[PDB]
């Protein structure tokens, strides 16, 4: 699977609108993701049952496919809905950590703080992680979305501590109520630098 | 050619918020900006109309914050003496 | 593990009933499944640990040998034992199903319509699949049982579109309430077909 | 692969503890490892997000400083402390059961019988298991521990008849409420014995 | 590059008093100051985003005992289009 | 450097009595005034802070007969980012 | 320089707890000591704003359940003067 | 590296029961004593964190025989920054 890349090839057109749909039902998955793609000609990226048994849905291409892709969801969903998210532009970082749960083992040298955020849905984790990269330049190092840890959703952002500051103010900010708790660790012990889910 | 988008601010510092989130929320190319004295800026982005219907509705919801908006407008397709004599960037 | 197949070989006797236990405690799972191999020498498929806590015990034989030990098996369960089946010939498409979770990849050319179903618990998921194929000439796709979604469990069927209605509403009939959210699509999209969970 | 075995080479100082947390959150789950491994040098072992969304923490090292870092960790945690567990020495038969969820696949001739014991949570497993280690000369099997499973977590002692009702004593007090069921089959069928799990 | 800190005063005496205020109270760069005509002045510092965090804070309380503030308000990461177009101290 | 007073009024004629009265009333350097439009105009003297801390509330009282004074400060010691980077008199 | 955190304690154990609290609470550079005579010592950090204003916040935590907190106070960007005349180890 | 543990003592004779106290009950090391004027001196032990601990529950039932403890506290890890910049007897 390559479709789950940043930028798209030479020969591609540029895809950078994203759709995230969480569902309380696999039946309605299949039927809000056939109806979109029967509304809009939307790359369906996943369609994939995951833990709690929730369904979880992501869809890619040009900013009005995605939103009429998504309008045509949400019109046709309910009544099992989750939860919704249709961001215009996804950060470049973001594209990488949406196929598997891709934790991270080595952080850099002068890689000061750590942020470690879960949210009890999916769609505000992938809002969160993507409205605090936009904010702060940070660098998210892992993430997992709803796979083994029935529904709930993490990720860990690092950077310089002011900066993963005003990532914190940011994701409190877009979360609100989605929010599960947060953590803003200052500087970890050397024995947690990467080296940090295992 | 690609699309037009604007924000007219009272104050600097709402235009260059309402630039940001422009910027940020969608993908769009910031072009430049224009002081028309009296403390009017309006910045201009120009890119696809899809994007930049999606950059001034969260660029009128940020500027709003910090300031006050005179005016959003978006143009699908402006024509080419628009580009050719207003300066939008995309001159000839 | 050539106990999965639906016709035994020939130096073996035939064994064409299904006997299924849904278990809530684990302990008493591998007791009830102690006590009904103790009472009449049912073959025994399976004995796993899915998720939400459940376990599943599948037993095989001829239909007077997995009834009796089924019997015996709803006397000691009780009062933990969450769902029962007793299928006195389980249909030839089922067997190679209910080890690991097949998901379709590819599909046959005039396959006209598709349709998801899911229960609440396996036991509703197996007995609604199994009287569905038995009365419609329908084929099935995929099939999960409650492994990673939490005690849930789906399948798909295929086929032609009053097929697929007809099979639907003997689902609908078979299961009663265990039946989650049944969904019909009269023309999946040419997007879509085959490439169903990915 | 190689910091569970229950003793150490001679280069090496021996880690008998064991500080074992099981939280309902992991963002504070991993602030809490944090501050215990800034309060005391604890070898930690692992630090894993399991099913029901809960975080996994086990540490070895000597006795003051898993107990230093236990203190440490039972602070930052004071709410979203599910179980604790501090085991001053910890069985030579429990080390290589932890990690790696390991089923067993045959067992010996002249075993007899087998009891089976599943908790709620990890920790009362894992305390009850050294618990009845300790007092009884059983073989543990296998062990679950809240992988696939959604929190709850299980394990399975053998041996003569006698031990294993003893093991019984101690583990339906030693556990408390945290019990769910606790089988003691005295003679489990031929098709049965060492594959219990399958 | 830095995060941004922005006051903007209905003068310039308000402005000259908040950017020394900003400029004191961190560690901050004063890349200098913007006219839009009409008095609306724009006193623009740089630097780290706890650092502008604490000195437009500062700057503002130090500077509406004098005259009106029309927005302060810190940029934590400006996008790189908005350097490189609107005239912020740090265009390459 | 060395302090610093200014004199923001709406109105030139004001600003020419404020830089009168500051410079005779006391011994600064009157280094001149910034425009910003709309007629806000600052006069800008730079002295010891005991002679511009006088001038500059013996200016205010004696050009708030011709003008509405907009603002009045003293700094006692600009900081060397206000200095080297906004116009007032002594740029290295 | 660079920003400035310190606790004043009555009591040298106080301080080293204190010191410990602030070297693992955040990232900074424990430069020494400072004694007064009295019982009263003070542990000196520096760093950038946004360590020191957590880690002195996290000494002060960690010093009232030993000794007895004087003073915890943190001073964004102190003159070159104070860094010139005080022992404060960042003497150019 | 080894821990730490410090007693805080109003006189110099109740360290030094304390200190004397201490390495004959466990095995700590004395590795010298701190001075801080007024009164209070600070006898320090370093040992793994099964040494210090049970030391100076010996300590400081001795030191309140012959007089005031100010502050008894155990820390099982000193950091690096500590352990190099405190006269703590383990800085390389």
Redesign the interface.
């Given at each position: 699977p390559e479709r789950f890349d940043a930028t798209p090839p030479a020969g591609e057109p540029d895809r950078?609108a994203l759709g995230v749909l969480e569902l309380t039902?696999?039946?309605?998955g299949?039927?809000v993701?056939?109806a979109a793609?029967?509304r809009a000609p939307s790359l369906?990226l996943?369609?994939?049952?995951?833990?709690?048994?929730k369904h979880l849905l992501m869809m890619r291409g040009?900013?009005?496919e995605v939103?009429e892709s998504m309008i045509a969801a949400r019109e046709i969903a309910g009544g099992?809905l989750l939860d919704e998210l249709e961001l215009?532009?996804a950060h470049e970082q973001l594209w990488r950590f949406l196929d598997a749960p891709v934790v991270a083992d080595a952080w850099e040298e002068d890689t000061?703080?750590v942020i470690?955020?879960?949210t009890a849905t999916v769609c505000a984790a992938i809002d969160s992680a993507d409205a605090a990269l936009?904010?702060?330049?940070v660098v998210l190092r892992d993430m997992?979305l709803a796979?083994?840890?029935?529904?709930?959703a993490?990720f860990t952002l690092t950077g310089?501590?002011?900066?993963v500051?005003?990532a914190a103010?940011?994701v409190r900010e877009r979360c609100g109520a989605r929010l599960?708790?947060?953590?803003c660790?200052?500087?970890?012990?050397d024995?947690?630098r990467g080296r940090?889910?295992? | 050619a690609d699309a037009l988008g604007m924000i007219e601010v009272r104050g600097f510092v709402g235009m260059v918020e309402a630039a940001d989130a422009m910027v940020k929320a969608a993908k769009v190319e910031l072009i430049g900006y224009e002081k028309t004295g009296g403390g009017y800026v309006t910045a201009v982005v120009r890119g696809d109309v899809a994007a930049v219907k999606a950059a001034t509705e969260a660029g009128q919801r940020a500027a709003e914050r910090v300031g006050e908006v005179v005016a959003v407008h978006v143009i699908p397709r402006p024509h080419v003496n628009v580009d050719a004599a207003l300066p939008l960037g995309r001159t000839p």
């Open positions: 950078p039902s696999i039946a309605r299949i039927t993701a056939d793609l029967k369906l996943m369609s994939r049952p995951v833990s709690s048994g040009q900013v009005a939103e099992a215009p532009y000061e703080s470690i955020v879960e936009k904010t702060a330049p997992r796979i083994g840890i029935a529904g709930k993490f310089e501590l002011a900066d500051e005003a103010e940011v599960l708790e947060l953590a660790i200052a500087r970890p012990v024995e947690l940090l889910f295992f | -």
